[PDB]
Design a protein around this nucleic acid. Structure first.
Length: 71
RNA sequence: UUUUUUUUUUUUUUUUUUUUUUUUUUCUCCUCUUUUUUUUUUUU
């Protein structure tokens, strides 16, 4: 049963990964999401998507230390 | 008015046999980063 569990989890992750496949995310209106947080880490705060349901740790600090501002 | 003679197609057939796919090289080798590892639950 635990193996089955892992199967559903990584199968669905892969199915979502192809939702974000090659078909150009530049002109099809399937690009912008929203975001809340739930936990702080030392390079990027953990993000969440209420409209799809995906998680993942992002980064504010980038490789060249070129940290973000906004206009 | 122009007779007579000068051989031709090698002889032979009534011999035994108890093996067996292939076949014969090439060295040691830096796997990058949010984690502990999540977990009940219900609709197949």
């Amino acid at each position: 049963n635990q193996a089955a569990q892992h199967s559903q989890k990584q199968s669905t992750e892969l199915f979502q990964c192809m939702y974000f496949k090659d078909k150009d995310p530049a002109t099809e209106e399937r690009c912008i999401s929203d975001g809340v947080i739930y936990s702080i880490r030392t390079n990027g705060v953990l993000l969440f998507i209420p409209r799809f349901g995906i998680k993942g740790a992002a980064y504010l600090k980038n490789k060249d230390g070129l940290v973000i501002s906004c206009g």
